[PDB]
Design a binder for this molecule. Structure first.
Ligand SMILES: */C(C)=C\C(=O)c1ccc2cc(OC)ccc2c1
Length: 126
């Protein structure tokens, strides 16, 4: 009854494609109304399309954030998918780069219900 692996792959691919061009309005639509993006920093989770919109607006509004799909998009048949990305930007006045594993869980309507992210900071200074 949930989205097949192929659908998940396509959806996450499209998600990356939407992030690449900074289509925030389109991105927010891919999430469920009560979607949740858990924090990888031990903060309380983002919840609702409003907070998600604000989050993506904040982080993508600048345009100075690069995101590259490094690994292939994998997915099971439990409506869950995973992918490996590299994020590159600069906070304050210090260059920053990190590898990120995104895990997305889709609902029966094909929208993102729960999303998790796992970081691995890239060595740059030494
Ligand atoms: C990349 C430069 C940043 C993130 O991917 C990022 C930043 C902040 C949050 C907060 C949160 O819950 C408050 C969930 C995910 C992220 C992701």
């Amino acid at each position: 009854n949930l989205p097949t692996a192929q659908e998940v792959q396509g959806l996450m691919a499209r998600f990356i494609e939407l992030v690449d061009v900074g289509d925030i309005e389109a991105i927010v639509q891919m999430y469920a109304d009560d979607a949740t993006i858990e924090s990888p920093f031990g903060q309380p989770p983002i919840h609702g399309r409003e907070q998600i919109a604000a989050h993506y607006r904040k982080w993508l509004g600048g345009g100075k954030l690069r995101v590259y799909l490094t690994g292939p998009v994998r997915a099971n048949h439990n409506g869950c998918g995973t992918m490996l990305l590299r994020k590159e930007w600069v906070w304050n006045g210090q260059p920053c780069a990190t590898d990120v594993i995104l895990v997305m869980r889709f609902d029966e309507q094909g929208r993102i219900q729960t999303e998790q992210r796992y970081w691995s900071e890239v060595n740059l200074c030494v």
